[PDB]
């Protein structure tokens, strides 16, 4: 049979560490890792920490750990395939699927790819050094003119936007310019709350419509405030502007 003889030590230690992480953070979930560069992933882990913690390992070692637990955490296994990693937090599930968006994926766009974002190069002064850089921008986008201190960028217009890929040389002048125009992100495949698992597709919808119903409720009170024949605080200007106003509707009107 193709199983090994003795399970290697580090595989055992890692399953323990993963279980340890899982034990804390009363809300736990699996997300993506998508594809994402190291420095960018660090900066996702480097945002304040202290809210959620990202735990990466082999999908099999994450799946071992969920089987050691599982009073609730078994069903989290069907959501583990692909590149993927564990997340856990003391925070709420609904606030969990947010803040993941916070400072995510600058995405430098290596050559050979199509980005849904705008690759437009702006106008300003970079001026690395007088040289082929003047001609480097010429073979891609709006010309670079050298004015009195160094090379500069003239036109603020677009080079490429969407529907095709990036030039190889552009990718290198986008790297020299320090341009990262793409958005991918760290997804969330599922999460476990108290007794139940939350799939992002259902019940996880989000904020304007809440801020739309929340202002509609405050306007619901001020609409009934002066019709109460009562006295209010901020609604005190109700009668103040109705003093000399509606009085003429019973006098001047008819």
């Amino acid at each position: 049979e193709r199983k090994t003889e003795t399970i290697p030590e580090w595989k055992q230690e890692e399953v323990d560490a993963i279980v340890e992480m899982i034990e804390s953070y009363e809300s736990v979930g699996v997300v993506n890792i998508a594809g994402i560069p190291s420095r960018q992933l660090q900066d996702m882990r480097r945002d304040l920490h202290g809210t959620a913690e990202l735990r990466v390992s082999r999908n099999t070692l994450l799946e071992r750990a969920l089987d050691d637990v599982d009073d609730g955490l078994e069903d989290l296994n069907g959501y583990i395939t692909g590149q993927v990693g564990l997340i856990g937090t003391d925070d709420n599930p609904f606030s969990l699927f947010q803040e993941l968006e916070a400072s995510k994926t600058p995405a430098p766009i290596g050559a050979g790819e199509v980005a849904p974002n705008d690759i437009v190069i702006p106008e300003g002064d970079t001026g690395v050094d007088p040289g082929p850089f003047v001609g480097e921008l010429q073979s891609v986008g709006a010309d670079a003119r050298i004015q009195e201190g160094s090379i500069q960028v003239l036109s603020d217009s677009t080079v490429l936007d969407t529907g095709e890929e990036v030039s190889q040389e552009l990718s290198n002048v986008l790297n020299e310019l320090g341009i990262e125009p793409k958005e991918v992100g760290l997804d969330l495949r599922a999460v476990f709350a108290d007794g139940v698992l939350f799939e992002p597709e259902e019940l996880e919808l989000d904020x304007x419509x809440x801020x739309x119903x929340x202002x509609x409720x405050x306007x619901x009170x001020x609409x009934x405030x002066x019709x109460x024949x009562x006295x209010x605080x901020x609604x005190x200007x109700x009668x103040x502007x109705x003093x000399x106003x509606x009085x003429x509707x019973x006098x001047x009107x008819x």
Partner: protein, 145 residues
């Protein structure tokens, strides 16, 4: 012309004053006054209201020069010594660059600083190499913690 200049002084002449005239003048003088003098920085164009700036943070190897004295590093590190750098001085260099380091606190940030200090033969007390053990044993906690 561009906007940038070293120094921890106030308004070091021609890069700043001449270019900034309408309508902002000298209102940016507060930002570049940082103690170390050098702090090369870059000022972004702004609206008429105030100004906008960012602070470029100097390298770590050169950050320990302005503390430990003579700037020549060790020819043979962990052999010849510069020599010394005080322990609380390292605390200062560590709080200096927050984003330039990946650490979540001063404790680990210090380790990187002293990490580099091995290369220059900085010999913080007895030797830069012993530092990780010492600080992991909670030696210097009075400083950091």
């Amino acid at each position: 012309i561009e906007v940038l200049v070293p120094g921890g002084e106030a308004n070091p002449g021609p890069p700043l004053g001449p270019e900034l005239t309408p309508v902002d003048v000298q209102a940016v003088v507060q930002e570049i006054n940082d103690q170390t003098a050098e702090v090369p920085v870059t000022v972004k164009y702004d609206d008429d209201g105030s100004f906008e700036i960012e602070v470029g943070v100097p390298p770590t190897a050169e950050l320990i020069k302005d503390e430990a004295g003579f700037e020549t590093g060790s020819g043979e590190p962990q052999e010849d010594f510069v020599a010394d750098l005080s322990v609380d001085q390292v605390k200062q260099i560590a709080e200096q660059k927050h984003p330039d380091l990946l650490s979540y606190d001063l404790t680990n940030a210090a380790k990187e600083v002293v990490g580099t200090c091995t290369s220059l033969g900085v010999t913080i007390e007895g030797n830069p190499r012993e530092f990780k053990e010492r600080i992991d044993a909670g030696e210097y906690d009075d400083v950091f913690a």
